[model samples]
Target: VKQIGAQLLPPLYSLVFIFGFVGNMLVVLILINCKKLKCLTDIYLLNLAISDLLFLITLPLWAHSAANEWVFGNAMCKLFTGLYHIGYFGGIFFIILLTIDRYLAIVHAVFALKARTVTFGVVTSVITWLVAVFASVPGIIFTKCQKEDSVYVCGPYFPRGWNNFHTIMRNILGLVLPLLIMVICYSGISRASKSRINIFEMLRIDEGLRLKIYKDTEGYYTIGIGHLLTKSPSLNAAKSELDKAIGRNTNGVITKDEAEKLFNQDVDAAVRGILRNAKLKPVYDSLDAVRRAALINMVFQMGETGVAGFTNSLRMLQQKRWDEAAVNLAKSRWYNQTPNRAKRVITTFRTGTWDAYPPPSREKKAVRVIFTIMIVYFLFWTPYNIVILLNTFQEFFGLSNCESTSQLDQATQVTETLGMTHCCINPIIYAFVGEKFRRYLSVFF
Candidate 1:
């Protein structure tokens, strides 16, 4: 069972490595060179990509180890495990930071207006790397190789309760808390945007109106003696012309210091100008593009988590609904929306064969879903592990492996093949669902 499981790891690792490396690299290049990199949010995104790139590079070592066990020395073992954990922890931390950034941008607009800057993002990222290094040190501490003759096994060999504690910490820190933060931050950002509290939405007013308003703001800020300057058209025009001679500077008309004194007088006029601007619609739409970007980001996050199918199967499995669990789990490979994978899982579930499935195509989402379900379901329980868990029953029943290996070869082969299915599934997800990523491919290449 262990050999079978290990044998399945290489192909999946390769596919993930290839796509993840390219994808993350593309993210880095685009954010680094693009004009949008100036945005504080984009800087965080760049760091997130760096984390994924680090994670992807570690895959080859893992793949090699999986097939032949720990051929690499103890130091390599420590380095690979350490690098992998560092990448994984860094990814989670950056994701959380991203969520927090969005939360601050949308939920606390005033603070965001003051705080959004590349320096802030860079400092936070430096701190995140420090934490990630701290978190991954334990991987080097625990990883080891078990060898027999020509064979060697690499991975953690924790002592007793340490394994369970490790699992708990890994899952909660790496998955649960990050997932919760992502969900919450996204939900809040969506609420703020949907409710019209977003500044981008506010900026959607016409450009002619905005110019008129900006001119008025200048006049208000330059108010002399008693009368408000922007209230009069002549002073407003003069201020607009004067600003043109000066410069546009940081978007808004008045300097930060002047913002308080101008108060409702200047701001109200500026807002009215923004609301009236007919020429600035395109600019407003561009500013608002972040909303669409966030939507795609959320989808990418959900797809990686396999939340839909994983949760569905777990719910069924916990209830002792085997058939329902299988069906739901299978659906994960080919998402219900994808009919092909569903058919494949259903066919296998009924007939017990890999051969009786549809050819891959658009229906592969279903296939992917089913594949994930079977792989994870199988992964979570090694056949021998099931026996271990049910050892109490085994003692009563005198359960044993087939006396002769040949006697159970067919059943063993079936388990082996199915168990190996976990590898090589996610690339299918990249092939099928990644339209934007596909567009990016040619650009990167």
Candidate 2:
């Protein structure tokens, strides 16, 4: 064993010490300074990194001991071996702690949210260290340097009488126990994560209102983006209630505050129902907020069942082929039914820019007017280019200047500079007048 240890252990230990020390210290630094310890898992990771670092610091001593006789004596041998066991057992327990933490978070998020406090995590970490120490007791008691034939070696000094007992304790406490706990934790986590309906699903269905009120094909008093009045008792009843509360002279026109109160009552539940019926809950839950909203809005415009008619569109979207999905959406029967609305929805999916028809404000109108003026300016510059071309032709042919040669030359130079200024001006026109281009340019600023 010592011969094998000499050939392999020193090199292995040296490499482990260097890489492990650097890697663990970097993890510790990020945990301490870069990230906020917001979750119980973060705290466990921080502690795990610390325990690994502790184990790493002993590798240099082990590497030296592996290559040569244990010259540090029995006292140093006991100390280093005990420290190693503490680090090793502590690391195993911390990993188990992390597994349990993830299990609780994934399996019982609501309970975890309430129970997973900073104080609870801190206390758990302290208890883990205490348990690790208890587990390390045998290693601590038995580890010592002893002379064996011609060389000194550092290892657990189990007496012949207690050898079987020590082996049982080490195997059970060090390997079997932690392994069992980790398996159970991960199994529970996987089950819960697979079975539950997560928040992302709910969020994908809950798109905010686009139109406060609009009539469906059925001519029902549908209101909100989800068009709930046909099915919503509260919304359907709201119209009559408002008709009685405010005089009919107001023509059933509800205020924004009143509309919000009515809209919120059933829209969320309606959307969830719609998503479930469409069998798109999984697809919706997998998407990000922007794409989720796009999906919800699409369903809202065309009912859940209607949107699913474009199987190619939904499939492309599920695969995250945004442009392809948009193209599929555009070519659908739904798009043919309402070109304007479909174009708006298609554009939203293609590029995550919402509010397709932003009511043209004075600033927008001014931008359009400026763009038109730039086009007119370019047209005028076309005439100037022709004049310069005519002069170039005259010069090439060696035509007479007619005593206005210098004056024409000066005018032409000014025209040329003015024409060059148009190149600079064109980009300026795009920067201010092109809203999307302006937004792109704003990134540098």
Candidate 3:
């Protein structure tokens, strides 16, 4: 493998570096010079191309060294190696980000639409670069140029057992974990493509297959696919069998085979039965399966009787009042009880779009108070400054006589006092105009 690598690496690396360098540079210029990066994908792509360019720029050094020996000094060698690792790992991470962005947009478009702002993209990109710096630190710390017989090679040089540790860390974090995530995301995207059936089924399967038997917050024994023990006799029977086969009170742990059988026998039937029930038949027949699955999941979380509590929402759903139904759902006890899950289900119900989390409300009254103060300051200061400026200009041009100048000074003092009153008026703005502040003051005084 080493001999074959020696024979092929130089030319291949050279070709890749040349094309990648030029292509990525053009991408960089285009993104940089654009009027605005409106979407998360564009911002992520800009950083992705930048990372690729950084990696490509260092390739010529590697290509030269692959054919000849390392002629660059030790510092240069370390710098180049560090750059390569930074670009390689950073580019990998950015691709993973892009994959996630695509997954969100396609699979959970509503949430994506609300959450994937330019600010969000920029923050995440900054975080990606910071992580890349952390990853690149190992390369910077370990890389050196060392002589081997007649030739000097540039590579990582570690003391004692660190070589194996370094190699493992680099491969696992820089390659394996990222690759695994990308595979899962792409698989989700593909499933998201083939009608909502594939998407919702994947969701249902994911919801169903926790594999570990544990009690939920409600103190019920829950197992595969969120199956509650108290709700299903079959599942209870399966648990009893597990105690008989293994030991009594073995923490209710069942084998994978037994879990699968229990899931098939009990949880699957519950989901299907709930989907087809008379109360939910309107949702099942009118809505697509993905949406129907969302409704079923809600029903599963609560029960048929509990779901009946959402009478207004159900009535709206039957009337095809999508937005109203979603809003009504949002205002329910279920929504208050489980906000994160409710947001996802409500988004899907409203617009056939899913989101992992809803957009957070901007309720920072302090910030609003500061913002209002700034606007008031600007309003008061601008006219005062303009009056003073005009007085100076009048003096320069001899626009007024000495007697008029005395009068002008008095006018300037009046304008300055008016500007100062803005400070006092600020309190009144907060007292009357600022709702949050008014409420607080009312409670306080």
Candidate 4:
């Protein structure tokens, strides 16, 4: 795999670094040097271009190191890794935020009134960047330059047991979640803004509203708030949105404000649905606010029925069997799929703490001693042995005919003399270069 990667990636990464950096830099230059942030999307687009620039800067290091293994040492290794993440998450989040801006102006064009302002954009961008840094942290923590086989590699080096913290979080946040949001937003645009079609319904989500309606696995067309009916296009002077399917596409449309009414209705129903569950009502009543909110989070994600299926967990949670409930929750596929959030939820379940509950020195001098000894001894012996062979071959055939042969003899003697000196000089070598020997000399005398 590395053979192919070493062959392929450096060239590709180089090309990417050049074009990506210059292209994004041009964009950033143009964005900043030429214009003001008039549109909200302008700010995101600018940040996104800059994010690509940050991500692009990491490429040359990777490209240079690809054909050759990492020799950059610890500081650089950490620098590149952290920089990669900052660029990565910033670009992705900014792109998503830009898409959200699009969704607002297009699908929820009415709400974009106050939503899509420059001030709001800048604030959200700041918050998004802060979270981006927060996301970068696990990779930074786990990363270091480490030698493997004959070459040193730079990357995440997780703790032996819970080693997947960076990878899991990396993919979910960096790869999966961004892709997921883009897919949703792109669909929102395509679904809501088709030249011929108008939006019929928009569902409220934590990130933004989604105009694209999908059929639930349960066979009904669903709203994002996890509600049952879809809508028809209100298609007013401002195009309206809606979707519904008890059995068919009767999805009538509504405005962004009308969506508010339906949105609240769906939310209220979801709340009632949770309380309506017989087992959970008691569990719900007994918990503190944090635990209660966590439950709401769970029910929100999986839907009421989905949460209800966690029978043993609910039972354990009902009686405050925190550990048992956590273990039970951890066993499910949901935990594996969304482990980033699920772990937090599970931890909350187990300990009720939403707070994050979060030294190698050396064999260096010993190795350094060997390194120096090995270098001097081998270099000293090498010329001696070569001269020995040269003299022996020439004399064995009785072919030594010139004064240079005498010089060779002297050279051989000199090298052997050097080699011999090494035998006795090992202690002196250490005494000069060794830390312990320096201390010993000072103390002993």
lDDT of 4 by residue, 8-121 (tens): 767767765665565556445544555456666568767776766666677778867868889889999988888777876785576556545544444545556446567988
- For lDDT, the strongest prediction is 3
- Candidate ranking (lDDT, best to worst): 3, 4, 2, 1
lDDT of 3 by residue, 50-133 (tens): 776776677677667767778989999988877777876676677667656655544545445556668989898999999998
RMSD (Cα, Å) of model 1 = 20.1
lDDT of 4 at 261: 44
The TM-score, computed over Cα atoms with residue i paired to residue i, of candidate 2 is 0.47
lDDT of each: 0.50, 0.58, 0.63, 0.60
State the weakest 10-residue window (summed lDDT) of model 3. 357-366
Q: What is the TM-score of each candidate against the true structure?
A: 0.52, 0.47, 0.44, 0.42
- Cα deviation in Å at residue 63, candidate 3? 2.3
- The candidate, 1 or 3, that scores higher on lDDT is 3
